[PDB]
Design an enzyme around this catalytic site. Structure first.
Site, PDB file in Angstrom:
ATOM      1  N   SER A   1       0.436  -0.939  -6.650  1.00  0.00           N
ATOM      2  CA  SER A   1       0.725  -2.042  -7.545  1.00  0.00           C
ATOM      3  C   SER A   1       1.535  -1.562  -8.737  1.00  0.00           C
ATOM      4  CB  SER A   1      -0.566  -2.680  -8.041  1.00  0.00           C
ATOM      5  OG  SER A   1      -1.506  -2.793  -6.994  1.00  0.00           O
TER       6      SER A   1
ATOM      7  N   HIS B   1       0.798  -1.212   0.000  1.00  0.00           N
ATOM      8  CA  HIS B   1       0.000   0.000   0.000  1.00  0.00           C
ATOM      9  C   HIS B   1       0.835   1.267   0.000  1.00  0.00           C
ATOM     10  CE1 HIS B   1      -3.287   2.697   1.620  1.00  0.00           C
ATOM     11  NE2 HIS B   1      -3.867   2.077   0.610  1.00  0.00           N
TER      12      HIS B   1
ATOM     13  N   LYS C   1     -13.855  -6.828 -11.545  1.00  0.00           N
ATOM     14  CA  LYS C   1     -12.886  -7.565 -12.334  1.00  0.00           C
ATOM     15  C   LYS C   1     -12.304  -8.728 -11.558  1.00  0.00           C
ATOM     16  CE  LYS C   1      -9.148  -6.842 -15.560  1.00  0.00           C
ATOM     17  NZ  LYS C   1      -7.766  -6.338 -15.693  1.00  0.00           N
ATOM     18  N   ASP C   2     -12.477  -8.735 -10.241  1.00  0.00           N
ATOM     19  CA  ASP C   2     -12.098  -9.876  -9.426  1.00  0.00           C
ATOM     20  C   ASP C   2     -13.208 -10.898  -9.333  1.00  0.00           C
ATOM     21  OD1 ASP C   2      -9.433  -9.755  -8.518  1.00  0.00           O
ATOM     22  OD2 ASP C   2      -9.941  -8.019  -7.285  1.00  0.00           O
TER      23      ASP C   2
ATOM     24  N   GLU D   1       3.365 -34.520  -1.800  1.00  0.00           N
ATOM     25  CA  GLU D   1       2.288 -34.116  -2.677  1.00  0.00           C
ATOM     26  C   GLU D   1       2.885 -33.280  -3.807  1.00  0.00           C
ATOM     27  OE1 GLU D   1      -0.808 -32.198  -0.553  1.00  0.00           O
ATOM     28  OE2 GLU D   1      -2.417 -32.913  -1.863  1.00  0.00           O
TER      29      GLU D   1
END
Ligand SMILES: CCCCCCCCCCCCCCCC(=O)OC[C@H](COP(=O)([O-])OCC[N+](C)(C)C)OC(=O)CCCCCCCCCCCCCCC
Ligand SMILES: CCCCCCCCCCCCCCCCCC(=O)OC[C@H](COP(=O)(O)OCCN)OC(=O)CCCCCCCCCCCCC
Ligand code: HEM
Ligand code: HEM
Ligand SMILES: COc1c(O)c(C)c(C/C=C(\C)CC/C=C(\C)CC/C=C(/C)CC/C=C(\C)CC/C=C(\C)CCC=C(C)C)c(O)c1OC
Ligand SMILES: CCCCCCCCCCCCCCC(=O)O[C@H](COC(=O)CCCCCCCCCCCC)COP(=O)(O)O
Lengths: 44, 385, 62, 431, 126, 54
Positions: free
Chosen positions: B206, B202, B228-229, B272
């Site tokens: 981004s 923050h 958009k998410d 795994e």
């Protein structure tokens, strides 16, 4: 002339700390012998 | 002012999910952060409602996973949403550590953001391992036996650490019963390191897929990247629901449905599928002490990446050579997830030694060399002398 | 009264400052609190760390 | 230039300089503001102004004689300037202002008109000269209940009690023969100055000035003259430095030349060789600072004064310059001394060997009273050309490393943090 | 983190030599249009990351008429890449319009911070 | 005295005296409190009851 610097920690600011950093390596080696002597770990 | 700004709690919601100025050019790879937030709540909520029926003794571990899948209403949903959703955690996250490795999101001023990434990545490897050994299957007893016997290679403090770690002399009742109360806990440490990961993001915001400044064109988060998410939330819920209802045991090993027996070893112990690349790095070194280091160095070599990238351009978007050699690294990482599944046989030892050299020569040799050549070619292509 | 006449601090002042002594009657009592808090935080760590070791009934079956 | 001394109870100092065009002649006493109790404080500031009164200065200006005086902590001074051919006229005036008579200056008309003039000067100093009324509050709280605490200007609450009988009782106790040096600077020969005092009498008093039973002692404290209606926040901060006549005299000045002085609005004081400027110019923490090493007779001070408008980040101004003080103990470089030699050799040559002969008479008068003679500038350059980086480090752990400080501030010093978070910055904890 | 004084020391060695200029300058031209920042309508000196304080300095010494156009070609690129399209073939940055306009404002800010650190570690020979 | 220069001046040797002063305090205070606790309870411990079984 110009001493060796590489950013912040120059050589002149490192030769004046290496006498004291030899004492912090002793004050932290004794820091282990407080927190481990109490379970068998033999350092020599 | 507005109440979403004037309150002490809502202004944390306001400054993070409503009014946070995101760059207006970020593609769909910037949704993998929002999926990992959803995929963390899926593991945690289907961990609490599953651990109300789970007894953690070595006698009642595997018998009370089957009590979940047979006797609890919708118990087959919870155990399969959470054993497969944990395997969808590591697939979204591997696409989240590869967006940031591609678009240059590791560079300055986001080195604080990258270092909390590697810390979350280590706790998530350690969380998904400690819950794997809670089913007490045959691959999970012999998984914990092979992993926690690597710490018997540390000189003179080896056996005292392992016997402390097992809580006994082998993987027995105190090991499984403490691999649950630990595995209950470390998600709440990941859920605090994520809050310490949004704070590091923050302050500088981004990035954007061009690698240029995004301070000019900024659009808010609310009703633009919220919606958009919601596209990729409802898609990730769809591909999870195929892997939960229609084919639930595709990802896991079949040997984990044998109850764990310390007397009979299985045919080939593998972890795994997501720890399988690092298991092939561990197995590549013909030494036990160097293997524990190099398998741990392979997660910590992500930290030398902000200092080895010698490019004046952020990210691989406008680069020819550093986009080709990135996809060699990704398809080398898939190959290491394949040599981890094969046995120790000719020639999967010359492959696993070469294809672990390419994992380490990417960060240390390839990225500093091909990004210095990608700066002289940007220069002498334009300057006429 | 002016602001150049400081009030009576004489009931609390020392009779002899001697800054090599006053910084040694005060780094003793800070160093003594540090000494028992390093012998007291060994035992707090060693209580919880040795709790995870091999218990009593596991050691009987050795 | 070579100073010269002679004594017959009244010691005569001279520094002949033929390339000047004036000739200061004056008497310098060794009893300044640190020889008064707090009930007669200001009587030496008032003995300056009746020497410079309008009735007395007009008599001096008839012969072409300008008057000047100076009231410091330890020494007073009373200088008469003239043209070089008229030095005996200046002594004849100086004889008939102090020595032959004091009753003409101390008339009831000239006194109350001068005491009213000083009482306006202090009331103007108390609320308009802000970076200096802190430095007089720094002395008032470092050396509290001790004769080095008294302000040289005199407090206003103690100055309106003075009668003429306090002006004369200070004269009969400190304006004595065994207290004064008669200095002659500028274009005057030592043989002409001595023979002129011998041709007249010029005998001041008998001797035996009082003893001052208290000795000066540093006492680390603070004082906060907080007042929000000011544009800035002035702060001085000091440890106990070295007195004069000490082996660490020049090391205390050279250590205060390492951090130098700064002025944020000049474009050439921002490019200096101080490492402190790399931390202080990023957010513009201050407008100016200066590092001083004051050295009085019994004790001294060493520290820095400052002034800033960034009143919310004072606690980074203090913390970033107190971390640089710690570097004197541990990791001061060789270059950071070798520039502070060559700056101290300059700003001493700009002080003892500047132009004005009035200022050279105060420095010659303050030197030969305290230490008996004047140390020349050519032989005070060898003392600065021999200070090694061991001697600064040996001095810094003596006086700076984890020692008690004295703080004085005014203005908007709310952002100035408390004492034990400033005292704790003197020791690094990481060394 | 490549320090444009060091690029231009290597880069001017290539262009000065007759052999290497015949060899790897045509490789450099084919590398430029394969990158395709021209197709988004950018010059190269929009691509340089502006978060170090050397490059933060050289974006203040820029004139107003060039810092207004540079602040437009960035917004045309955030708008073109948002639509997942390219610019139309008239709007592409041509070869002659791709000049290093911000290079001389960086080489005078890099040499002014190199001199600040060569002078902060000077050792005076007595 | 000069106790300040050797011990309390450098923090690297101040805290190195805290840890070397806690390594002696662990071994001594534990033995001094064990040897008091059994001496106050002389005759009740198993080391004394094993001596009555002669
Ligand atoms: C938490 C529970 C565990 C506690 C373990 C404590 C370990 C020992 C530390 C105590 C100690 O010795 O503290 C001394 C140092 C300095 O503390 P100080 O004495 O106030 O600083 C003065 C610095 N001189 C002037 C001496 C150079 O103090 C420090 O360096 C600060 C350490 C604080 C640790 C918390
Ligand atoms: C511990 C170390 C962690 C390291 C993690 C290792 C990698 C984990 C594996 C996950 C794979 C994730 C791949 C995502 C790659 C990064 C995203 C990306 O680069 O996509 C963008 C790229 C080109 O797009 P540009 O934005 O550069 O171009 C704009 C022009 N205007 O678009 C493309 O070029 C196409 C993208 C196609 C992705 C193919 C993925 C293949 C996945 C492997 C499957 C193996 C089966 C054989
Ligand atoms: C980042 C978060 C988590 C991850 C990656 C994770 C991963 C896993 C994995 C891989 C397994 C083994 C699944 C299998 O093989 O069947 C598992 C099992 C389990 N986990 Fe988690 N888990 C997470 C959070 C939690 C939380 C918060 C809890 C409890 C409150 C929890 C409780 C359990 C339980 C009870 C099992 C039981 C064994 C089973 O039925 O699979 N997990 N987890
Ligand atoms: C539980 C796991 C994680 C969560 C919830 C999480 C959360 C987030 C979120 C919400 C974002 C903003 C959305 C975005 O930029 O994509 C983000 C950005 C980022 N994350 Fe994570 N993260 C996790 C794990 C990781 C890991 C393992 C890494 C790297 C090793 C990492 C590195 C980054 C980086 C570099 C960014 C910034 C990308 C950019 O905006 O340019 N994260 N993270
Ligand atoms: C930068 O902009 C942002 C951004 O700011 C945020 C926040 C996100 C979103 C990311 C997150 C929200 C991740 C944060 C995740 C957590 C904090 C995890 C916390 C999750 C939990 C589930 C907390 C645990 C609480 C419970 C389990 C309570 C539930 C109660 C139970 C199960 C008991 C039920 C019993 C009874 C009796 C009802 C983004 O994706 C994003 O990019 C767009
Ligand atoms: C917490 C862990 C991360 C989870 C990631 C989820 C990120 C996206 C959250 C979506 C919330 C949508 C609310 C937007 C909104 O209210 O806008 C409201 C109205 O929007 C709507 O009506 C959308 C219809 C309801 C959508 C229901 C989605 C629920 C699915 C939940 C899946 C995620 C848990 C205001 O929108 P407006 O300002 O444009 O007018």
């Amino acid at each position: 002339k110009t001493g060796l610097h590489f950013g912040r920690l120059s050589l002149r600011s490192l030769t004046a700390y290496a006498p004291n950093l030899m004492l912090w390596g002793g004050a932290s080696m004794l820091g282990l012998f407080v927190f481990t002597e109490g379970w068998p770990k033999f350092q020599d | 002012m507005a109440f979403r700004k004037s309150n002490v709690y809502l202004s944390l919601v306001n400054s993070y999910i409503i009014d946070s100025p995101q760059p207006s050019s970020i593609n769909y790879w910037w949704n993998m952060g929002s999926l990992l937030g959803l995929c963390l709540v899926i593991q945690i909520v289907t961990g609490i409602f599953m651990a109300m029926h789970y007894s953690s003794n070595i006698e009642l571990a595997f018998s009370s996973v089957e009590h979940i899948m047979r006797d609890v209403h919708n118990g087959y949903i919870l155990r399969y949403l959470h054993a497969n959703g944990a395997s969808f955690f590591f697939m979204v996250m591997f696409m989240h550590m590869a967006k940031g490795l591609y678009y240059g999101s590791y560079r300055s001023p986001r080195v604080t953001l990258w270092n909390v990434g590697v810390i979350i990545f280590i706790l998530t490897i350690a969380t998904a391992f400690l819950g794997y050994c809670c089913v007490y299957g045959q691959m999970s007893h012999w998984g914990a036996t092979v992993i926690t016997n690597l710490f018997s290679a540390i000189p003179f403090v080896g056996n005292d650490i392992v016997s402390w770690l097992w809580g006994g002399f082998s993987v027995s009742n105190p090991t499984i019963q403490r691999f649950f109360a630990l595995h209950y806990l470390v998600p709440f440490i990941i859920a605090a390191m994520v809050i310490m990961h949004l704070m590091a993001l923050h302050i500088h915001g981004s990035s954007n897929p061009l690698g240029i400044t995004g301070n000019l064109d900024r659009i808010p988060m609310h009703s633009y990247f919220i919606f958009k998410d919601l596209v990729t939330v409802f898609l990730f819920m769809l591909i999870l629901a195929l892997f939960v209802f229609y084919s639930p045991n595709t990802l896991g090993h079949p040997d984990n449905y044998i109850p764990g027996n310390p007397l009979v070893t299985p045919a080939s112990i593998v972890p795994e599928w997501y720890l399988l690349p690092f298991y092939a790095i561990l197995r590549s070194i013909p030494d036990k002490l160097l293997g524990v280091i190099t398998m741990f160095a392979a997660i910590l070599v992500l930290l030398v990446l902000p200092f080895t990238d010698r490019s004046v351009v952020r990210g691989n978007t406008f680069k020819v050579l550093s986009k080709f050699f990135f996809f060699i690294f990704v398809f080398n990482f898939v190959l290491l997830g394949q040599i981890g599944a094969c046995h120790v046989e000719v020639p999967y030892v010359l492959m696993g030694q070469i294809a672990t050299f390419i994992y380490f020569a990417y960060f240390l040799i390839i990225v500093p060399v091909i990004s210095t050549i990608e700066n002289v070619l940007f220069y002498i292509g334009r300057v006429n002398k | 009264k002016s602001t150049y006449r400081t009030p009576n601090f004489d009931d609390v002042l020392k009779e002899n400052n001697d800054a090599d002594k006053g910084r040694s009657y005060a780094y003793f009592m800070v160093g003594a609190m540090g000494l028992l808090s390093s012998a007291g935080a060994k035992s707090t760590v060693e209580t919880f760390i040795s709790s995870m070791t091999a218990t009593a009934d596991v050691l009987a079956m050795a | 230039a070579e100073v010269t001394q002679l004594s017959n109870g009244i010691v005569v100092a001279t520094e002949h300089n033929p390339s000047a065009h004036t000739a200061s002649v004056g008497v310098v006493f060794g009893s300044g503001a640190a020889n008064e109790n707090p009930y007669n404080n200001g009587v030496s500031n008032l003995w300056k102004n009746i020497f410079l009164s309008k009735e007395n200065s007009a008599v001096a200006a008839k012969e072409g004689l300008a008057l000047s005086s100076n009231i410091s902590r330890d020494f007073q001074s009373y200088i008469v300037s003239s043209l070089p051919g008229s030095t005996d006229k200046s002594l004849d005036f100086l004889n008939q202002s102090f020595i032959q008579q004091k009753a003409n200056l101390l008339s009831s008309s000239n006194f109350e008109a001068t005491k009213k003039s000083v009482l306006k000067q202090v009331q103007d100093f108390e609320e308009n000269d802000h970076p200096n009324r802190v430095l007089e509050h720094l002395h008032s709280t470092a050396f509290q209940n001790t004769p080095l605490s008294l302000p040289t200007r005199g407090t206003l609450e103690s100055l309106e009690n003075l009668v003429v009988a306090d002006l004369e009782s200070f004269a009969n106790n400190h304006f004595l023969n065994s207290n004064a040096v008669v200095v002659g600077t500028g274009n005057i020969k030592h043989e002409d100055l001595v023979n002129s005092i011998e041709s007249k009498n010029l005998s001041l008093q008998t001797g035996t000035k009082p003893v001052l039973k208290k000795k000066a002692a540093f006492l680390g404290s603070e004082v906060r003259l907080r007042d929000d209606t000011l544009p800035k926040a002035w702060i001085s901060l000091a440890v106990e430095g070295e007195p004069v006549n000490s082996p660490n005299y020049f090391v205390a000045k050279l250590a205060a030349q390492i951090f130098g002085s700064y002025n944020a609005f000049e474009p050439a004081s921002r490019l200096q060789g101080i490492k402190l400027l790399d931390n202080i110019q990023e957010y513009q923490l201050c407008d100016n600072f200066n590092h001083f090493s004051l050295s009085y007779k019994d004790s001294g001070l060493w520290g820095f004064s400052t002034a800033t408008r960034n009143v919310t980040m004072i606690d980074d101004l203090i913390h970033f310059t107190l971390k640089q003080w710690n570097r004197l103990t541990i990791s001061v470089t060789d270059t950071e001394v070798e520039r502070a030699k060559s700056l101290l050799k300059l700003q001493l040559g700009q002080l003892y060997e500047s132009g004005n002969p009035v200022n050279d008479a105060n420095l010659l008068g303050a030197e030969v009273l305290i230490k008996g003679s004047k140390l020349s500038l050519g032989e005070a350059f060898k003392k600065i050309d021999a200070i090694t980086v061991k001697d600064v480090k040996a001095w810094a752990g003596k006086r700076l490393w984890d020692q008690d400080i004295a703080i004085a501030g005014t203005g908007q010093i709310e952002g100035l943090l408390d004492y034990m978070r400033i005292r704790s910055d003197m020791s690094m904890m990481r060394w | 983190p490549q320090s444009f004084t060091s690029i231009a020391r290597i880069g001017d060695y290539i262009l000065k030599s007759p052999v290497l200029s015949k060899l790897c300058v045509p490789v450099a031209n084919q590398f430029i249009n394969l990158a395709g920042y021209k197709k988004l309508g950018l010059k190269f000196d929009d691509l340089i990351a502006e978060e170090n304080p050397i490059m933060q300095t050289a974006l203040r010494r820029l004139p107003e008429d060039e810092s207004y156009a540079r602040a437009y070609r960035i917004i045309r690129a955030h708008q073109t890449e948002l639509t997942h399209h390219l610019l139309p073939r008239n709007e592409w940055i041509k070869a002659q319009e791709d000049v290093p306009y911000l290079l001389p404002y960086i080489l005078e800010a890099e040499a002014a911070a190199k001199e600040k650190d060569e002078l902060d570690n000077i050792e005076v020979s007595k | 005295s000069s106790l300040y220069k050797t011990f309390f001046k450098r923090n690297a040797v101040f805290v190195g005296t805290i840890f070397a002063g806690a390594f002696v305090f662990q071994t001594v205070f534990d033995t001094a409190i064990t040897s008091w606790y059994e001496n106050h309870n002389k005759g009740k411990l198993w080391k004394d009851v094993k001596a009555r079984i002669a």
